[PDB]
């Protein structure tokens, strides 16, 4: 994949860095309780349901494919939405107990490019850059980053718990309250990166 992730046109999968860390995932299956919205999980194999792309925050006009004039790069410290590619939904959280980790917040996929709320805005916080590439940008594999909800202030995390059979026993994803900086369940990296507009990164 290309070395720098772009807003909108970069298709990425995102891997958790804790032990047993897997790929951020969504599918057209609802939570049976909680908010009953579309599930978000982690999955262990390559799959089109692992594909996400970055979108502009709620509050400004969104990026669209017809925007051929400009390529913008995702920057540490800035806010973005994360869109599930196949379903078009926003990575979402809210003050709802998580399915298994009842003291944490449930994470779902909700809405679309136009519909949702400001809990779809996440701060991308870069916490480690391997190599001497632009420290402000996201690079596949070498960048570790955290995903902090702009409204609730919690961190996206692979909890370590497994969902029941209704979540195909995939891994629970939560928004951790009071996470430590060095809690690797809240550390993520770009695993795969696809973008036809960018120089390929050999």
Residue numbers in the entry: 331 to 532
What do the authors say?
In these structures each subunit has 11 transmembrane helices (TMHs) and two large hydrophilic loops oriented towards the ER lumen (LL): loop LL1 between TMH1 and 2 harboring a catalytic DE motif, and loop LL4 between TMH7 and 8, encompassing a so-called MIR domain, whose function remains unknown. MIR domains have a β-trefoil fold consisting of six β-hairpins arranged within a pseudo-threefold symmetry.
The high resolution of the Pmt2-MIR (1.6 Å) and Pmt3-MIR (1.9 Å) structures allowed for a detailed analysis of the respective structural properties and ligand interactions. Given the high sequence and structural similarity between Pmt2- and Pmt3-MIR domains (68% identity, rmsd of 0.7 Å for 194 Cα-atoms), we focused further analysis on the Pmt2-MIR domain. An almost identical arrangement is found for Pmt2-MIR site β in the MIRm1-MIRm2 interface. Both cavities are filled by ligands present in the crystallization solvent (glycerol in site α [also in Pmt3] and sulfate in site β). Taken together, we identified three putative ligand-binding sites in the Pmt2- and Pmt3-MIR domains. Two MIR-motifs form almost identical surface cavities and are conserved in all PMT-MIRs, while the third site is specific for MIRm3 of the PMT2 family and is highly solvent exposed. Our analysis of high-resolution X-ray structures of the Pmt2- and Pmt3-MIR domains revealed particular ligand-binding sites (α, β, δ) on each lateral side of the triangular cap region.
